[PDB]
């Protein structure tokens, strides 16, 4: 139940890109989920702010929430698509895949 | 209800660090709160992944969650403190003050 990367597959049909695209038909976009709480490492899975916010939340849970599980590393995906002039284009889409999660 | 920066003043005395922390006696540590949903405001600086995730969540709310409202721009603060051996240390702690929030 800790802050971690979960598997998620996105087909290009879900984006309505299916008719445009040749390869791939989808990709593993993945997602960050989990409770953000101690232990926390400021050189691994948390920021200094996230450590301080966890402390404030423990003292006053009413008004300040816990930090949240978000990406630390994102990868690009390369897509091969057709255009109207029947050109074959290779486009790199940055910040598209989740590699590692952390508390922010 | 939308993702934004909320003001929060962190005083070291309520944290219980007043003895060993010389300067400052507190600081404006702010926090991120709110829903990451469409419309995604340009200030959010949402990644391509966050956009896809808010879209995937809208189709299957059951399994895939909304992306995180987290800090996009942090500031460092200098802390003057007493070491465990009574030495006076002047450390710059990075990622300490939230300047701006966003979705990822
Ligand atoms: C942040 O990273 C640390 C270690 O780098 C993770 O530490 C583990 O915490 C879990 C939960 O208590 C335990 O199973 C292990 O005993 C811990 N290892 C160490 C070396 O302390 C920690 O879970 C991570 N935090 C989050 C929110 O993901
Ligand atoms: C800035 O704003 C938009 C829309 O929310 C986003 O898609 C883009 O990636 C952001 N740019 C940077 C440089 O963070």
From Swiss-Prot, chains A, B:
Its main location: secreted. The keyword Methyltransferase does not apply. Glycans are attached at residue 45. Keywords: Chondrogenesis, Cleavage on pair of basic residues, Cytokine, Developmental protein, Differentiation, Disease variant, Disulfide bond, Glycoprotein, Growth factor, Osteogenesis, Secreted, Signal. GO terms for biological process: BMP signaling pathway; bone development; cartilage development; cellular response to BMP stimulus; cellular response to iron ion; cellular response to mechanical stimulus; endochondral ossification; eye development. The keyword Secreted applies. GO terms for cellular component: enzyme activator complex; extracellular space; vesicle. Glycosylated at Asn-45. Glycosylation is crucial for recognition by the activin receptor type I/ACVR1. Disulfide bonds join 3-69, 32-101, 36-103. GO terms for molecular function: BMP receptor binding; cytokine activity; growth factor activity; protein heterodimerization activity. It is found in: Secreted. Belongs to the TGF-beta family. Interacts with SOSTDC1. Interacts (when glycosylated) with type I receptor ACVR1; the interaction may induce HAMP expression. Interacts with type II receptor ACVR2B. Interacts with Hemojuvelin/HJV. Interacts with ERFE; the interaction inhibits BMP-induced transcription of HAMP. Interacts with BMPR1A/ALK3. Forms heterodimers with BMP2 in vitro; the heterodimer then binds to its receptor BMPR1A /ALK3 and may induce HAMP expression. Growth factor of the TGF-beta superfamily that plays essential roles in many developmental processes including cartilage and bone formation. Also plays an important role in the regulation of HAMP/hepcidin expression and iron metabolism by acting as a ligand for hemojuvelin/HJV. Also acts to promote expression of HAMP, potentially via the interaction with its receptor BMPR1A/ALK3. Initiates the canonical BMP signaling cascade by associating with type I receptor ACVR1 and type II receptor ACVR2B. It is linked to Iron overload: A disorder of iron homeostasis with incomplete and age-dependent penetrance. It is characterized by adult onset of increased hepatic and systemic iron levels, increased serum ferritin, normal or high transferrin saturation, and inappropriately low or normal levels of hepcidin. The severity of the phenotype depends on age, sex, as well as additional genetic or acquired factors including alcohol consumption and increased body weight. This is Bone morphogenetic protein 6. The chain holds residues 410 to 513 of 513 of the full protein.
